[PDB]
Design a protein around this ligand. Structure first.
Ligand SMILES: Nc1nc2c(ncn2[C@@H]2O[C@H](COP(=O)(O)OP(=O)(O)O)[C@@H](O)[C@H]2O)c(=O)[nH]1
Ligand SMILES: [Mg+2]
Length: 177
């Protein structure tokens, strides 16, 4: 089996931990969500290769932010997340996440991930964003950002419905390889 280190980053509450959990446990967490997922190695088969993915969760609330840069050494692939229900989180991709990741992880491939895709057509989300003269992130905007930061790929998923979750890790593995 091939061994790869994956680091997930992006704005607070954009769904990083839930994404890791749904991929690892095949269940969206109702009941409890930790700030960061437990130390975990996932198994995935991609293109007839067995690979082990160390899943490094990160966060931003006070202490985890200082811990975050210490997590970048020897990363093989980055999941760089924003939430489709948060245009703000998308704008933070070129302003915060890409400068940080490019600094600590030169040459490391990035999968730009649009989380919470289930909220794109959500009435409540649309009404809330409408008061800001905003709307959920369009897939074309996701793609354009991926192009702009020279991501390896752009993917959308919903940890909540599981839609697209497996492909995120499959693409990340292919990049990591
Ligand atoms: N609607 C929806 N909510 C989600 C999804 N993933 C996570 N959430 C919610 O978003 C919040 C933040 O999730 P979390 O994984 O802790 O985000 P993190 O801070 O980036 O690790 C929680 O209230 C989750 O239930 C999703 O795919 N769809
Ligand atoms: Mg988290």
């Amino acid at each position: 089996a091939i061994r790869k280190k994956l680091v997930i980053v992006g704005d607070g509450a954009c769904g990083k931990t839930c994404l890791l959990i749904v991929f690892s446990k095949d269940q969206f967490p109702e009941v409890y969500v930790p700030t960061v997922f437990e130390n975990y190695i996932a198994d995935i088969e991609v293109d007839g290769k067995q690979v082990e993915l160390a899943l490094w969760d990160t966060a931003g609330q006070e202490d985890y932010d200082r811990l975050r840069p210490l997590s970048y050494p020897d990363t093989d692939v980055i999941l760089m997340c924003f939430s489709i229900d948060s245009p703000d989180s998308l704008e933070n991709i070129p302003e915060k996440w890409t400068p940080e990741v490019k600094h600590f992880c030169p040459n490391v491939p990035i999968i730009l991930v649009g989380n919470k895709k289930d909220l794109r057509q959500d009435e409540h989300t649309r009404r809330e964003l409408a008061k800001m003269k905003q709307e959920p992130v369009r897939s074309e905007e996701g793609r354009d950002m991926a192009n702009r930061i020279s991501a390896f790929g752009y993917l959308e998923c919903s940890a909540k419905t599981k839609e697209g979750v497996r492909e995120v890790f499959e693409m990340a593995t292919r990049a990591g390889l």
